[PDB]
């Protein structure tokens, strides 16, 4: 139920995908055969957008679909609510807090019971995080070592204003609900919403 396949590859075809890979793609070397499909059918544009989303967060389709139903339900602007929902996933928050290298990494971190949300172990990636929530490492040697090395050796200080990080114990804190401008990717949710008119 997880994408274990070649990553660079999906990246060449989709675009830039942070939650997947930090290695910038090869020059692309397709300039020999110069093979194109011509251009893309409007359908293919829509499809590639959705795929962008899906692989950035490591979600399965059947899951994405149910997020979208939750989205159409919710009273509000649909694409926005969707992006909220996807961006509140525990593993993704674990990632954007620099507590992980990438999303498969963060996911693994959560799975192996190395993380705590308000003094309780949550081992499932898709646990939805709500405002005022404590993201901690379990107090064991291993957990702490992991989080420390992956947090410190990665310099990025981009923290998106709803996310606090605190230094020695390493208490991360979820402050509030995401803003559409603070979202974790370049995507027109409009296209995805459109793709999903038929479900």
């Amino acid at each position: 139920s997880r994408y274990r396949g070649p990553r660079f590859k999906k990246i060449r075809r989709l675009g830039a995908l942070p939650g997947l890979t930090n290695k910038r793609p090869r020059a692309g070397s397709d300039l020999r055969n110069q093979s194109r499909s011509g251009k893309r059918s409007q359908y293919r544009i829509r499809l590639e957008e959705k795929q962008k989303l899906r692989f950035h967060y490591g979600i399965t389709e059947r899951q994405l679909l149910k997020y979208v139903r939750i989205a159409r339900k919710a009273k509000g602007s649909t694409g926005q609510v969707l992006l909220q929902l996807l961006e509140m996933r525990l593993d993704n928050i674990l990632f954007r807090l620099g507590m992980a290298p990438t999303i498969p990494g963060a996911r693994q971190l959560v799975n192996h019971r190395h993380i705590l949300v308000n003094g309780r172990i949550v081992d499932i990636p898709s646990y939805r995080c709500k405002p005022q929530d404590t993201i901690m490492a379990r107090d064991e040697q291993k957990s702490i070592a992991l989080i420390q090395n992956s947090l410190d050796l990665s310099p990025r200080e981009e923290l998106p204003k709803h996310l606090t990080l605190n230094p020695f114990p390493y208490k991360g804190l979820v402050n509030q609900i995401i803003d559409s401008k603070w979202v974790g990717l370049k995507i027109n949710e409009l296209l995805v919403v459109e793709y999903y008119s038929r479900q």
């Binding site: 649909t78 609510v81 949710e189 409009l190 919403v193 459109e194 008119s197």
Partner: protein
């Protein structure tokens, strides 16, 4: 009076030859053309089948300005181009709301093409079929419901869409027509 030869050679040098001056200026007009349909229509002659290409193309800025045009030639390329040029001289403006959608619900009729547009909440995107959707999208309408009832001809549906969004009245104007303040009609 200056001499006839140098002034007529001035209007001759200012109207430039079409055999010494190549053509690409079009991205300077701030537009984008979208080929909706390419078909091979045929005239028939004693020799045989004489093949032409019809192009149905719509132009917009994606900023609230759109038009349709149709063209015919031997090669895809030239048809496409004439289509562009024709649309550019047929063009109109679509009334928009602060959220990028339609003022109101509207139908439209052209030939056997009937068209129904109604405004949508922001965040629903543009959901429609081929002609209607490319025209809408190229106008820059962000959120709209549309369905074409009646026929399916790509072309008549394009025209129809245009007649729809042409007859769209914006509130300031109905307030100007009726002679009544805005806040009164809002209620």
């Amino acid at each position: 009076l200056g001499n006839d030869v140098y002034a007529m050679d001035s209007k001759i040098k200012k109207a430039t030859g079409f055999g010494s001056k190549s053509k690409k200026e079009k991205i300077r007009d701030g537009f984008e053309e979208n080929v909706v349909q390419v078909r091979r229509v045929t005239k028939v002659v004693k020799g045989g089948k004489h093949m032409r290409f019809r192009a149905i193309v719509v132009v917009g800025d994606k900023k609230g300005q759109v038009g349709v045009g149709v063209g015919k030639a031997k090669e895809v390329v030239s048809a496409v181009q004439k289509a562009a040029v024709d649309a550019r001289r047929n063009i109109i403006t679509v009334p928009m709301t602060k959220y990028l959608t339609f003022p109101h619900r509207n139908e439209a009729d052209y030939g056997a093409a009937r068209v129904m547009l109604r405004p949508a909440a922001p965040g629903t995107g543009v959901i429609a079929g081929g002609a209607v959707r490319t025209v809408l999208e190229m106008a820059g309408v962000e959120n709209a419901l549309g369905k074409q009832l009646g026929s399916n001809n790509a072309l008549n549906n394009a025209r129809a869409t245009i007649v729809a969004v042409q007859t769209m009245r914006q509130f300031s104007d109905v307030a100007r027509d009726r002679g009544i303040p805005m806040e009164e009609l809002w209620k």
